[PDB]
Design a protein around this nucleic acid. Structure first.
Lengths: 146, 26, 43, 667, 49, 317, 60, 112
RNA sequence: AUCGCUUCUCGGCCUUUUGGCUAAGAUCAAGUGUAGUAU
């Protein structure tokens, strides 16, 4: 597989490679990390590893500004994401989160419907937005040579 | 209660997004 | 008040900055062709 | 003292820039300064230049303003040199001057940076200025579409069912028109090999992909960045977009689904003309004989005029407000599809260092962009035509009319607009005005725009392709009428939505003083002359003219004389110029296949339009002789002639090049 | 008249390692703060009703 | 104030000509006062009409920035020099380059014609000044001895016939017959970019960012220090009435009395509308033959034309 | 004039019926002027936050 | 060897002897006076000439007028382009190569 | 209080250090088998 899920080992080399090469040399960083292309490596930085991402909890003034802008420019998340200062993935998910709480508590029990909206046995389209696997104890020949 | 305006605003958004198109009877 | 990007105005007019007593002249095009010389030969 | 001839130019200038800045930094420093850090100031200049090309705002936190003011000057100085050289080189490339593949590659690389800098400005302005479409005009546009669709009794396109047995067929068609992009070569990069992997899996297990596509529509709203790059046609540049394969496979299916269902529903009325059953030259044929079948159309006894307007919806794609578009799409499709389609346009465009969020318009490179353009076009057709007339052109929902017919002769006469079609953005309208109606419409125009100076006759677009006795006479009545029609049409359309321009539109008036009306429908142009007028003979000299009957009596009533458009000629010439570049050109059979493919691309499209266009036949002879000389140089030969023609024209099965001939050469 | 040293977002000709805090501190693109004209709220509440 | 200055009328802008697409680096007036050349970093030479301000004729042949332009007073020729390393003769009867004078190793920053012997002298950044015979296009002398870029050259018939200031802060007075330095004046702390000879009094002035100094020929005796214009000054020109004009790289322009060094007017003109506030700057200024118009070549790509306030005197002191 | 969001929608509602869909009243049985004069309280609150957000960035 | 003969300025080619007899102040002022007057005077001459053509139109139109024999109401938008006078954009010179009127027309032509 | 020697911390010198430009100069990918060199 080329791409796939992100582990902890690749993330530490990815930080260190931006020190050497900068944020405008992505094919020199991706020559240092096999089974990952430069397009994927760029996306992984800009959406879960740039420290400017406010990974903390949503406050009340953030939610109030979210709900307005979601009404104000329907579905156009990328136009909203620099304004509220969060990743668009986080922006969409939290909006989906807020809707789910209000509708469920007012009408429904714990689940009621579709227990497996989750997708087992298939690839995720965007695992750059997902947290990292830890590093296995027995690192293979590929990772140690890397 | 209406003091929790976020709960009122979230409810309004749900009603506005999911409605099926005017050319079929609502 | 609505303005289109294709009609937006970014800078003052030349007469406004210099003021009325100063002439302004703008010249994109030569008034005579390259064949017609400056110092006319004695014909 | 070796000269700065040509290849030395750019490296020389960048020396002289840095050498000049060295003088200033020595002079500007106070005389007690540490006699160093000159090299540090220069490196800030090199950084400020790079930030300018990348459109990043350059700012140093603690830099002192005498240095900063100097650098901000010289960056602008270099920018003025850099931009003007892009202008100069492009005006050479268009006219066909001496050029090389290096400067063509470089100049394209400059122009695409200059485009994006303007584009980032434009998108940023939209958020700051607020939406140019007013909250009252938008509601008007929306309400119009609602009443239209209700009148047609349109049944909304549902979300595609699980048991929808056509789905597998639509999937196969989607994948096939994806794989056709890769017929060119076996040399693939990483992203392209991944695409073929995903395609093969979809063939091997359709019920996998169909579940994954449907899961995308219901849930996915944030998409990855798309590349941009430009196809260089010399005369202009065309954007090309690169979309990540997993998104592309879903979009391709969705495009196939939407067009199938919309056809079945009969969404699009018949005037939306790139149609499955009609090649573009057949469109022009049905258009010409469409004109001639109108009642009384050539009569001038009372003083009737016919007016033909050609125009473009100038910047249609670039303006489309996504917030409006989302609600418009929701009238057709299931909302989940509408949300997907809208969101998919709000993506980060990327080219090297340069990135910005697109948010004010559609992306032409998306697989379903052709759907959006025609539906949005349909919204604006209703603006131009009005609800009432558009219902008569399309006819009753039980029994819709075809392309250019009406229920009754009586319904033709009810309104000036007798014929309408829209190609993509190009508009064609045909008006029939009675004696009194033409006068009143002129007066309104002159009331807004009085002309005692007789300026109206000056800036009137006319076509030089035809003799002085054939092109439009600028009679004062006809000119005033022609402008006034265009003014009326232009008023119908809000400038926030779209616009029409006099510089690019064309108007032609049939009148008691002008017997010919010109127009230029698709790639080729023509003029119609009725036989009761200036011809007075049933000529048959060229095969390049259509005799066309009145459908009732089968009498010939007019002649249509074809010619190729000046633009279409230039298109072909640049394609020949493009062939004469590259280094694979030394392989003789790789050239002659490109020549043959180009030549049949012209001839089999235009057919009898070619022979009447004597200007273009001379170009064909020129282009043929050039490529034959290219073969000769591959065998040296140079100036000494008498080279035998047999090697070119002998068919490939006998081992010749198989060149197709379009000139009077002789053995 | 001290000059803050240049640390590019690009070239690094002698291959040196530069710490991220120097490499990422492009302050000039952060200060701009995007803002939305209120007239959207007129539009977006017109169509919605 | 020990001396009493002669009163001079203040100058006022009346005509902003525009139409170049780069920095206007040079200006020169034709001897019959009908037209004037400019040369620019748009790589063109534009003949402008001096009265109407109409653009007469645009000339094309250079490959890079035009740095110096001069109209020949005896012959119908238009000598121009650039960063191309090329120095060209434009025969105005045909508007074509007939003779171009190769030989320089690097950029040519300025040029001047000797008024009586029809000889071209040019400055270069390569620390050399070359002397050219017009007719034969041959290098007569290579004046070497500066250590840095030679900025400005002026010629006169009386000895010393050639004066050069340069970026090494020294001014060298050359013997044209020998080709060797006569006097080396080091009194400037920073680059001499401008030198001007007074038309009647046998004295010359030199400009550098520290101070403008008036010096006496032939031996270069120090006369007066004229202080007050503290910017990088690019050009100096003098009217026979004793009006000295100092135009700077920061666009400040001071009007000075030659006899006393009195600063009677400071002129800070405004930038062309779209331009940027640091772009303001003066690279060349020249009086016409009438000595009643001041043609200044600006860094915001404009030509500003000034004339004199005809009113009676209040401004004097 | 800042209006409460419920009150704002009500006033807007009445206007649209008259101008664009006059038969709605029968079935049950200007716009630019209105929008220029009245704003929802939510819209007002958003503007306030945006001003404070600019100030916080400036203070940083 | 090329152009081995110095061309010298003749009498009618602004010879220095004529330049020695200068009254350039009078000559320059006279030329500027004349040019300013004439350039302004050009405008009424046009109107004067157009006045002849304007007068010719009633006479001409009378000959067809002599008795020789012896729908917009259903468009939702009105007057959207009322008062767009194009005459003011092309007269503005802007010293910015990206916002220059030349560059805008350039992009519209070459990028479609 | 002053001077000298030896640990221990810090400031200024430490630009003594990134020695250009063009289309971020351009492009982006791998597996198996045999002969020569070295241990």
């Amino acid at each position: 597989i080329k791409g796939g899920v992100w582990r902890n080992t690749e993330d530490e080399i990815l930080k260190a490679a931006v020190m050497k090469y900068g944020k405008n040399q992505w094919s020199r960083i991706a020559s240092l990390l096999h089974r990952k292309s430069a397009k994927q490596c760029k996306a992984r930085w800009y959406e879960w590893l740039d420290p400017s991402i406010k990974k903390t909890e949503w406050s009340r003034e953030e939610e109030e500004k979210l709900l307005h802008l979601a009404k104000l420019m329907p579905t156009q998340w990328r136009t909203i994401a620099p304004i509220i200062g969060r990743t668009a993935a986080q922006c969409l998910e939290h909006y989906e989160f807020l809707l789910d709480k209000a509708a469920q508590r007012d009408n429904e029990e714990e689940t009621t419907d579709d227990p497996r909206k989750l997708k087992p046995g298939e690839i995720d389209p965007n695992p750059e937005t997902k947290p990292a696997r830890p590093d296995p104890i027995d690192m293979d020949e590929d990772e140690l040579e890397m | 209660a209406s003091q929790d305006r976020i709960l009122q605003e979230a409810q309004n958004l749900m009603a506005l997004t999911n409605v099926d198109t005017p050319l079929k009877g609502g | 008040e609505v303005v289109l990007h294709e009609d937006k105005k970014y800078y003052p007019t030349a007469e406004e900055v210099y003021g009325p007593e100063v002439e302004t002249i703008v010249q994109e095009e030569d008034t005579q062709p390259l064949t017609e010389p400056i110092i006319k030969p004695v014909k | 003292a070796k000269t700065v001839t040509k290849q030395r130019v750019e490296s020389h200038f960048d020396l002289e820039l840095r050498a000049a800045v060295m003088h200033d930094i020595l002079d500007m420093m106070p005389e007690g300064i540490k006699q160093n850090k000159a090299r540090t100031i220069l490196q800030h200049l090199s950084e400020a230049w790079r930030c300018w090309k990348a459109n990043i705002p350059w700012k140093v936190p603690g830099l002192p303003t005498p240095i900063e003011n100097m650098i901000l000057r010289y960056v602008k100085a270099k920018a003025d040199w850099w931009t003007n050289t892009a202008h100069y080189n492009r005006e050479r490339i268009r006219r066909g001057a001496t050029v090389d593949k290096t400067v063509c590659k470089k100049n394209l690389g400059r122009l695409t940076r200059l485009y994006l800098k303007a584009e980032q400005e434009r998108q940023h302005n939209y958020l700051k200025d607020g939406p140019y479409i007013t909250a009252e005009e938008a509601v008007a546009v929306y309400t119009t579409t609602v009443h239209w669709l209700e009148s047609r009794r349109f049944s909304p396109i549902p979300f595609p069912p699980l048991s929808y047995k056509h789905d597998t067929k639509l999937l196969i068609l989607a994948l096939e028109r994806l794989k056709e992009a890769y017929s060119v070569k076996s040399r693939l990069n990483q992203s392209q090999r991944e695409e073929l992997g995903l395609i093969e899996q979809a063939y091997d297990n359709p019920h996998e992909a169909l579940s994954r596509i449907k899961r995308h529509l219901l849930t996915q709203r944030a998409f990855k960045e798309v590349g941009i790059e430009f196809m260089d046609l010399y005369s202009h540049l065309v954007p090309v977009y690169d979309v990540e394969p997993l998104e592309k496979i879903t979009d391709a299916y969705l495009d196939q689904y939407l067009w199938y269902e919309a056809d079945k529903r009969r969404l699009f009325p018949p005037w939306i003309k790139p149609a499955d059953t009609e090649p573009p030259p057949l469109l022009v044929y049905k258009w010409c004989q469409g004109i001639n079948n109108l009642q009384d159309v050539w009569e001038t006894s009372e003083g009737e005029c016919n007016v033909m307007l050609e125009s473009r919806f100038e910047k249609m794609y670039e303006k489309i407000d996504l917030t409006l578009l989302n609600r418009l799409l929701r009238l057709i499709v299931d909302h989940n599809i509408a949300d997907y389609m809208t969101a998919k346009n709000n993506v980060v465009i990327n080219y090297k260092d340069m990135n910005h969020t697109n948010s004010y318009g559609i992306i032409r490179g998306l697989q379903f962009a052709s759907f959006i353009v025609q539906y949005y076009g349909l919204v604006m057709d209703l603006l131009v035509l009005g609800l009432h007339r558009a219902s008569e052109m399309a006819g009753p929902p039980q029994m819709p009319n075809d392309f250019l017919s009406f229920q009754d002769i009586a319904t033709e006469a009810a309104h000036p607009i007798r014929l309408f079609c829209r190609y993509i953005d190009r508009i064609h309208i045909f008006f029939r005005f009675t004696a009194d109606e033409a006068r009143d419409l002129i007066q309104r125009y002159l009331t807004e725009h009085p002309d005692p100076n007789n300026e109206n006759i000056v800036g009137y677009n006319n076509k030089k392709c035809w003799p002085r006795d054939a092109r439009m006479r600028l009679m004062k009545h006809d000119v005033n009428l022609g402008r006034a029609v265009f003014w009326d049409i232009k008023n119908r359309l809000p400038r926030s939505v779209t616009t029409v321009q006099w510089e690019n539109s064309f108007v032609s008036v049939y009148s008691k003083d002008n017997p010919n009306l010109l127009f230029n429908m698709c790639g080729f142009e023509c003029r119609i002359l009725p036989k009761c007028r200036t011809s007075y003979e049933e000529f048959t000299h060229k095969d390049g003219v259509w005799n066309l009957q009145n459908e009732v009596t089968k009498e010939r009533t007019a002649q249509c004389f074809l010619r190729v458009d000046d633009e279409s000629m230039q298109r072909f010439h640049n394609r020949v110029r493009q062939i004469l570049m590259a280094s694979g050109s030394t392989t003789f059979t790789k050239i002659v296949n490109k020549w043959n493919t180009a030549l049949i691309g012209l001839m089999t499209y235009f057919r009898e339009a070619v022979v009447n266009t004597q200007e273009l036949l001379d170009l064909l002879v020129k282009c043929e002789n050039k490529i034959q000389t290219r073969i000769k140089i591959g065998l040296n030969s140079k100036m000494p002639s008498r080279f035998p023609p047999v090697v070119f024209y002998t068919p490939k099965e006998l081992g010749g090049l198989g060149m197709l001939s379009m000139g009077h050469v002789l053995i | 008249w001290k000059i803050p040293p240049c640390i590019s977002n690009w070239k690094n000709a002698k291959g040196y390692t530069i710490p991220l805090d120097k490499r990422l501190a492009a302050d000039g693109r952060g200060l701009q703060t995007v803002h939305i004209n209120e007239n959207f709220a007129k539009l977006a509440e017109a169509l919605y009703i | 104030t020990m001396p009493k200055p002669q009163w001079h009328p203040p100058w006022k802008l009346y005509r902003v000509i525009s139409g170049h697409l780069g920095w206007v680096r040079c200006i020169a007036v034709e001897p019959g006062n009908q037209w004037f050349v400019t040369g620019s970093a748009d790589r063109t030479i534009k003949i402008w009409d001096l009265a109407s301000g109409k653009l007469k004729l645009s000339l094309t042949g250079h490959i890079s920035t035009v740095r110096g332009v001069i109209v020949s007073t005896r012959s119908p020729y238009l000598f121009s020099c650039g960063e191309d390393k090329q120095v060209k003769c434009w025969d105005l009867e045909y508007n074509k380059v007939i003779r171009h004078y190769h030989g320089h190793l690097s950029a040519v920053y300025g040029l001047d014609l000797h008024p009586t012997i029809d000889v071209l002298v040019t400055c270069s950044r390569d620390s050399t000044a070359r002397i050219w015979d017009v007719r034969t296009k041959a290098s007569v002398h290579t004046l070497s001895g500066h250590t840095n870029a030679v900025a400005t050259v002026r010629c006169q018939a009386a000895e010393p016939q050639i004066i050069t200031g340069s970026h090494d802060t020294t001014i060298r007075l050359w013997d044209l017959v020998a080709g060797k330095t006569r006097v080396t004046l080091t009194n400037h702390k920073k680059s001499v970019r401008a030198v001007v000879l007074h038309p009647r009094h046998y004295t010359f002035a030199s400009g550098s960012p520290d101070n403008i100094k008036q010096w006496k020929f032939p031996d270069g005796s120090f006369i007066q220090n004229l202080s007050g214009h503290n910017a990088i000054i690019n050009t100096l020109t003098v009217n026979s009435d004793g009006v000295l004009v100092s135009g700077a790289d920061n666009g400040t322009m001071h009007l000075w009395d030659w006899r006393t060094g009195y600063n009677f007017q400071r002129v800070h003109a405004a930038v062309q509308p779209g331009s940027l506030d640091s772009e303001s700057g003066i690279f060349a200024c020249a009086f016409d033959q009438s000595e009643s118009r001041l043609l200044t070549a600006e860094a915001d790509k404009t030509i500003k034309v000034y004339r004199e306030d005809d009113t009676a005197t209040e401004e004097t002191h | 004039r800042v209006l409460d969001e419920e009150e704002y929608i009500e006033g807007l509602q009445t206007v649209i019926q008259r101008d664009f869909f006059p038969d709605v009243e029968k079935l049950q049985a200007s716009l630019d002027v209105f929008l220029s004069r009245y704003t929802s309280e939510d819209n007002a609150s958003f503007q306030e936050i945006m001003e404070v957000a600019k100030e916080r960035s400036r203070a940083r | 060897p090329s152009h081995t003969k110095i061309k010298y300025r003749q009498t009618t080619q602004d010879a220095p002897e004529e330049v020695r007899n200068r009254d350039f102040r009078r000559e320059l002022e006279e030329r500027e006076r004349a040019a300013a007057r004439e350039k302004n005077r050009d405008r009424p001459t046009r109107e004067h000439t157009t006045s002849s053509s304007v007068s010719k139109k009633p006479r001409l139109d009378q000959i067809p007028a002599a008795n020789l024999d012896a729908w917009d109401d259903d468009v939702v938008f009105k007057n959207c382009a009322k008062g767009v006078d194009d005459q003011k954009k092309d007269k503005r010179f802007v010293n910015d190569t990206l916002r220059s009127e030349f560059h805008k027309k350039f992009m519209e032509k070459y990028i479609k």
